[PDB]
């Protein structure tokens, strides 16, 4: 089963001129399958899911309040900030409004609003370290963190590190029961992932995920799925500079089909 998994991903890489990093882990973080699993890839927008977990932890701890109003001006509008732009005239979004927009719309301004509050990228890297992730690192805010310069180690993760971080957040007790359920529902309700991994999964699986798109052909999808009453965490990072945007979508869906084959056998 694992040789077919590797061969099928290698075929996608060959024919699409792509690199595909995949890690699937069980709720304990034990490896189910993987490909280029410790190669570094740009996180791009996928880090917004750990960012929301950070926020949830501070609310859990009484260090933050979900309804606290975060004021801003037009300087905070950057490319792809649809909710931030809608709330601009009102003058604020709450911590939780901003987090939900970052997870479910990949709103960049809302992400940066939260980054300003925690003291910037170093604090997000600090959260990765707190939950046992020594690999993932945030260095810059949006959108420049998505620059994806070849060989740059800034703003990177590995498939296995991020998959284990997903498992830690959802299954390993990083959040309260209530906060864990909330972030799970946010991932299921994500509005940006209809054409990526969940398009390649069976329609009865419960799936939630966070997408990413970066320069130089990056297209990513991380999250969880429940298949045959068993829970998994998954991270998929791909680089395909020669494909169109729609073809990169199709590539991640095709990776979803390869994962399905492995799981169902």
Ligand X SMILES: *C(=O)[C@@H]([C@@H]1NC(C(=O)O)=C(S[C@@H]2CN[C@H](C(=O)N(C)C)C2)[C@@H]1C)[C@@H](C)O
Binding residues: 45, 106, 108, 211, 213, 219
**If binding is defined by CB under 5 A, does position 203 make contact with Mg ion?**
no
Q: Residue 122 corresponds to which tokens in the numbers above?
A: 């170093």
Instruction: Please tell me whether residue 213 binds ligand X under the rule CB under 6 A.
Output: yes
- 39 binds ligand X per the rule CB under 6 A: no
Binds a second copy (CB under 8 A): choice among 75, 79, 204, 229: 204
Residue 203 neighbours by CB under 8 Å, 6+ apart: none
> Does 265 qualify as catalytic in the annotation?
no
Distance (Å, whole) CA 225 – CA 233:
7
Tell me the two tokens of residue 152.
């740059």
Phi, psi of 116 (to 5 degrees): -55, -40
Q: Among residues 45, 81, 179, 254, which one is catalytic? A: 45
* Contacted by 213, from a second copy, ligand X, Mg ion, none: CB < 5 to 8 Å by type: ligand X
The residues, ordered by sequence, that sit 6+ positions from 42 with a Cβ below 8 Å of its Cβ are 146, 147, 148, 152, 155, 156, 212, 214, 218, 220, 237
84 binds ligand X (CB under 6 A): no
Which is closer to ligand X, CB of 84 or CB of 211?
Answer: 211
Residue 75 binds which entry of a second copy, Mg ion, ligand X, none, CB below 5-8 Å type-dependent = Mg ion
Is residue 187 within a helix (H) or strand (E), and if so which, with residue range?
A: helix 177-188
- Only one of the segments 72-80, 90-98, 164-172, 176-184 lies at the binding site for Mg ion (rule: CB under 5 A); that segment is 72-80
d(CA 96, CA 118): 14
239 is a site residue for ligand X (CB under 6 A): no
Between strands 230-239 and 218-227, the pairing is antiparallel
> Site residues for a second copy, window 165-194 (CB under 8 A)?
185, 188-191, 194
Asked if residue 235 lies in contact with residue 22, where contact means CB atoms within 8 angstroms, the answer is yes
Per this entry, what is the length of the chain? Answer: 265
Site for ligand X in 160-199 (CB under 6 A): 192
Determine the interface stretch with Mg ion among 29-37, 74-82, 130-138, 230-238 (rule: CB under 5 A).
74-82
Q: Is residue 142 a contact residue for ligand X (CB under 6 A)?
A: yes
Instruction: Compute the distance between CA of residue 147 and CA of residue 56 in angstroms, rounded to an integer.
Output: 27
Peptide bond connecting 143 to the previous residue in cis, omega within 30 degrees of 0: yes
Q: Interface with ligand X by CB under 6 A: which range of 83-91, 131-139, 210-218, 251-259?
A: 210-218
Candidate segments 11-19, 128-136, 197-205, 239-247, binder of a second copy by CB under 8 A: 197-205
- Asked if residues 108 and 80 have their Cβ atoms less than 8 Å apart, the reply is yes
CB of 18 to ligand X, least distance (A): 17
* Interaction site with ligand X (CB under 6 A): 44-45, 80, 106, 108, 142-143, 146, 192, 211-214
* Interaction site with Mg ion (CB under 5 A): 73-75
Q: Which residues are catalytic?
A: 45
């Amino acid at each position: 089963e694992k040789l077919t998994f590797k061969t099928d991903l290698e075929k996608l890489e060959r024919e699409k001129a792509a690199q595909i990093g995949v890690a699937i882990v069980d709720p304990q973080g034990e490896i189910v399958a993987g490909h280029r699993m410790a190669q570094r890839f740009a996180m791009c927008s996928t880090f917004k899911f750990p960012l929301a977990a950070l926020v949830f932890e501070r609310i859990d701890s009484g260090t933050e309040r979900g309804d606290r109003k975060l004021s801003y001006g037009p300087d905070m509008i950057v490319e792809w900030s649809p909710a931030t732009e809608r709330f601009l005239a009102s003058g604020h979004m709450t911590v939780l409004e901003a987090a939900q927009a970052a997870v479910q719309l990949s709103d960049n301004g809302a992400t940066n609003l939260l980054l300003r509050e925690i003291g910037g990228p170093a604090a997000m890297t600090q959260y990765f370290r707190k939950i046992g992730d020594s690999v993932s690192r945030l260095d810059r805010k949006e959108p420049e963190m998505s620059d994806n310069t070849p060989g740059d180690l800034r703003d990177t993760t590995t498939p296995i590190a991020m998959a284990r971080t997903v498992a830690k957040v959802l299954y390993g007790g990083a959040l309260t029961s209530t906060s864990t359920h909330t972030i799970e529902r946010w991932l299921i309700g994500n509005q940006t992932g209809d054409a990526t991994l969940r398009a390649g999964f069976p329609k009865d699986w419960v799936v939630g995920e966070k997408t990413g798109t970066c320069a130089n052909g990056g297209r990513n999808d991380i999250g969880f799925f429940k298949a045959q009453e068993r829970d998994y965490a998954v991270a998929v990072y791909t680089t395909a500079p020669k494909l169109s945007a729609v073809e990169r979508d199709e590539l991640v869906a095709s990776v979803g089909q390869v994962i399905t084959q492995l799981i169902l056998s």
